[PDB]
Design a protein around this ligand. Structure first.
Ligand code: SF4
Ligand code: SF4
Ligand code: FES
Ligand code: FES
Lengths: 633, 633
């Protein structure tokens, strides 16, 4: 099973699924092989009913689409639609939160409130909204109005782009026409320009893609900002991860999907119901996280993470998962079928994300607590049906220190330099104790043995003194293999990095170091990494494409991950992707994305499927940035 | 060549392309066969980087997508993305016009103005904008603001849906949650819900598709409304169509694409430049139309239509097409390559729609006349380079009576009943002289011999006394085969229909009938057919799904045509599609779209590739509607 996942708890559940005849994502992948090489290379188009069109990567006809679309047009149009789809997910999430904040401060949803007043006022100031003499509720109404206004054209560009990057970066982007006019405007323009008989110039198409990726960045930053207002900015927390966080004698409830509007309410209402759960024979309600909504409640509340991404079905295979509470995105719809076998109650809550065979409980913010109780009573009832049944929870978990919002990182660093917190970090980049920074982001993918690329690359970079930060299921991969446990710093980190993590941790009273990898949150919380990197660029007086900072979507899957990698390139970072995106069927598109975009944004994709080679390429990119700043490397 | 096109002028140009070795759309189609059956049936998904996933229509594995997506989910998600793409095109067009109207009345674009003041005031009244005591420019600013507001959520739904359908239809749609909240909002929600791990219930997905199709309807109606304000509501005109409208001794300039913002300015500036063209040896500038922008200037100015859709390359093969002036959508990008062979100057004008190898002249409304002169001077220069070269313009053209906006149809009918214009039409539906109404819409498709389905179906329906109306390239097909020439009424029309067309035409002083088919305009002007049908429903006091009115996208191609067919079903019409959409790989999705949607909206798709059978099915649908109104049939 280690060819499927490097996670031992997942391997144990794969053996249970095999002997019980429960088909998994890995079995469905095997059944799909060999996969279509036209789609794998990007040389397929179904944008009109004259299709499907395909182009042989090599050889004879077909060489061109029926309408005359070349390989470079077809590849660029498909990639642009993936970016637009990713932007539609992250910004759908953000829009949901904007509507929740508005309802809250209009008195329409009393289960929600302004929890981080400080962040509300800072966002208002950043956006140019006056706070002096204003009621918090009125400021929040104006922030929610500004959030919603960024979805459409108006007399300003998207402010969750132009106010969150330094002016010199905005200027570079504006000079190339890359600043989005409106988030949903750009998504629709992509769908228009990529439809039949429209845009048919690869560079033009890909510039539109870069712009739409910044609409995705705006949605991510907006979702982090609004979720911090509503639910609190994360601070360092200690918890655990992997399937051993399930407890046979508790009602085990996973929150899965993306939006904390849902998750966060499940967490508080579940403790409210301890006594009812005990009344049912359970010790209590054990809320656990899957995917980004799990990361949201891990970061804010220390809720333990059960699993992530490709292995999500394995939580159900234990037999102990009484409920899986879903909102949207990244939920394998197989979970509704598996539930018939495992007893789990799978519950959808959002009207635009239903799964045939799952129970639907409409969630309304206006009725959030009651809707939550309804949902948790189904969970308790499911716990009751499994009294007497043995379960197989692998007794495998790791310790996880997390909660490293950008505010938390700056506060930690301020213990070493109170009035210039970023300076101790920059000092150690300059003296070589920190070689650079790498952000691990994005998914697992069934094509890659689960977590192998994240852990292989992260081990090489940590030994070379790279400060590693992580989000989403990249953070999930690293947490489940111990990279968020400070007890593993000696094993994993180079001496320079160890010295810095230890100095910061001691100054923070820890009696030891920060963990090897800093968990910066969910995938929208890649925006926190942008805030940190923009702050470092501003403090140094250089643009982002001069910093020794890189990103790696080492096992990417979702259209959202393609959008994140594309905005990482657009804001100026060397950006590794460890699965093949469907671009290899066009050399000119590949050359743009891996080379000539350097002359546009200064960032660039590094496509590399072999993780040791990827680590070497990421180190070379870091070291090239060091050299360009005149630093030793 | 008649297996490729039923148009004799196209056949002649196909012989010229063959002996000159110029590859055409039909050759690229042959080179693509056999096409992929997974894509043809809809059983392919590339929504994440675990893909491509496919499902065998029959047999053994693969049976399910890697994430667990079933065939019905994959088929429904692909269809929903096509609807969203279509909505993105028509509403991109509409948004462009809204911005042009705003610029015009703010003094920012003096080449544009309020030409149809009457329509401006009626649209304002329909939208609820006050006109009394207001400056036309202020009313127009408020209409343009309302147009732009319909792209995003606000305190009202999309008004270019709810104000253009009768209240009883709005109520039906609202009861099913189908009224769009914002045009670009719905497009983005589709892209979100269809991304990996999101919506996975076929009925839920398809309800979202129906709602997004009404966003496309709103974009079409908004684009017709705004283009009528700016450029005038069409009234009946007489012109010609097919390649014989090109003139060897003139500078031949085709306007191609969709938006009249461009086309309409080319038309007036070209007459301004007669003397310059004569100075170059030409008799003048001969502007001709291709595709919908050609339909826009045909309807408003009587500009002759050269060709449409699948045969658009053939205009260039004549050797006489000096320039092809493009905006966006439905332009085969092959035209940029063919131009190297034919001498034509292909000029793009919109920054989101470029074609490698074509000259780009940025068009700005603020500089429209100067930009137009620049463009037409390239055309004159191209004419000069071909002095001495023989050309081969087929001497084949038809007479075309067109210009039948809904206002023009009502005015024509008012000559028979001044204060109740729709009553003479309804009287003749009741007495059986008019069996029903059929709208032909949408594209040609290289899979169908060009125009064969439109003309075969239209001949059967006209003999059975159906009033036939047409738009877009359906109108193009029928015009090029003589269906818009009143001299062909005796040949084509049943005695009842002939009597009505003659009575209306005589009352209009024509000394003869209206033409066999009424041209209602471009594809956004399918909204004119909606206005007529909604007016008839309102006058009868019944909803649209009780009228004997059907639609046929007999040779559909573009995602826009899929969106139009889907909103035709959503507003209550039986809607034929004469090519296979990628739904046959899911019986449950097919059953929804062809049968159970009748219980939701009262409309339904009729998929039928054989045109004689399609005509029989369309007549049965009309006659079932007649029977339900208690009428003989
Ligand atoms: S848009 Fe062009 S390449 Fe794509 S399916 Fe249609 S004809 Fe083929
Ligand atoms: S979304 Fe599901 S069906 Fe589609 S490519 Fe990804 S794994 Fe395959
Ligand atoms: S031919 Fe396989 S993805 Fe289209
Ligand atoms: S397998 Fe051919 S369209 Fe994907």
């Amino acid at each position: 099973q280690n060819l499927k996942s490097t996670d031992r708890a997942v391997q144990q559940m794969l053996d249970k699924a095999k002997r019980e005849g429960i088909q998994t994502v890995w079995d469905r992948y095997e059944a799909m092989k060999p996969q279509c090489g036209f789609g794998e290379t990007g040389l397929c188009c179904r944008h009109c009913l004259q299709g499907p069109c395909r182009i042989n990567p090599f050889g004879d006809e077909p060489k061109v689409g029926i309408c005359g679309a070349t390989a470079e047009v077809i590849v660029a149009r498909g990639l642009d639609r993936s970016i637009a789809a990713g932007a539609a997910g992250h910004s759908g999430h953000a829009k949901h939160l904007a509507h929740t904040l508005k309802k809250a401060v209009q008195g329409k949803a009393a289960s929600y409130m302004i929890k981080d007043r400080t962040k509300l006022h800072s966002i208002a100031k950043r956006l140019g909204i006056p706070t002096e003499g204003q009621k918090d509720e009125d400021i929040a109404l104006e922030v929610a109005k500004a959030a919603l206004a960024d979805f459409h054209e108006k007399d300003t560009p998207v402010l969750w782009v132009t106010t969150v990057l330094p002016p010199s970066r905005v200027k570079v982007l504006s000079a190339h026409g890359l600043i989005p006019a409106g988030i949903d405007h750009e998504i629709a323009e992509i769908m228009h320009r990529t439809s039949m008989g429209c845009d048919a110039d690869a560079q033009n198409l890909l510039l539109g893609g870069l712009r739409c990726s910044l609409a995705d960045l705006a949605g991510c930053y907006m979702g982090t900002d609004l979720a911090d207002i509503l639910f609190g900015t994360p601070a360092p927390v200690v918890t655990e991860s992997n399937l051993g966080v399930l407890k046979a004698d508790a009602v085990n409830v996973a929150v899965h999907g993306h939006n904390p509007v849902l998750s966060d309410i499940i967490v508080s209402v579940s403790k409210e119901m301890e006594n009812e759960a005990r009344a049912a024979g359970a010790t209590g309600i054990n809320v656990v996280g899957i995917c980004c909504t799990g990361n949201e409640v891990l970061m804010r509340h220390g809720i333990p993470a059960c699993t992530h991404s490709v292995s999500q079905e394995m939580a159900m295979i234990t037999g102990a998962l009484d409920a899986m509470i879903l909102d949207y995105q990244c939920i394998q719809p197989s979970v509704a079928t598996i539930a018939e076998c495992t007893g789990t109650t799978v519950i959808t809550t959002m009207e635009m994300s239903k799964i045939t065979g799952a129970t639907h409980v409409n969630f309304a913010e206006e009725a959030a607590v009651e809707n939550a109780k309804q949902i948790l009573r189904l969970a308790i009832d499911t716990f009751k049906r499994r009294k007497g049944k043995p379960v197989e929870i692998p007794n495998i978990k790791t310790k996880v220190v997390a909660g490293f919002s950008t505010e938390a990182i700056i506060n930690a660093l301020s213990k070493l330099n109170a009035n210039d917190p970023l300076k101790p970090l920059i000092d150690n980049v300059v003296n070589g104790n920190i070689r650079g920074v790498c952000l691990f982001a994005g998914c697992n993918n069934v094509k890659v043995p689960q977590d192998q690329n994240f852990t292989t690359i992260a081990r090489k970079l940590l030994k070379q003194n790279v400060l590693v930060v992580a989000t989403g299921c990249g953070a999930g991969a690293l947490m489940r293999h111990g990279f968020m446990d400070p007890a593993n710093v000696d094993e994993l980190c180079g001496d320079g990095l160890k010295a810095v993590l230890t100095a910061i941790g001691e100054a923070n009273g820890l009696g030891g170091p920060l963990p090897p990898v800093l968990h910066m949150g969910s995938c929208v919380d890649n925006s926190r990494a942008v805030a940190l990197v923009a702050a470092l660029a501003n403090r140094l007086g250089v643009d982002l494409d001069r910093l020794p900072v890189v990103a790696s979507a080492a096992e990417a899957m979702h259209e959202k991950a393609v959008a994140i990698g594309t905005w990482a390139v657009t804001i100026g970072l060397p950006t590794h992707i460890g699965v093949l995106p469907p671009i290899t069927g066009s050399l000119p598109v590949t050359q743009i994305l891996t080379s000539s975009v350097k002359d546009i944004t200064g960032g660039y994709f590094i496509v590399e499927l072999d993780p040791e080679t990827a680590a070497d390429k990421l180190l070379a990119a870091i070291n090239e940035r060091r050299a360009g700043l005149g630093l030793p490397w």
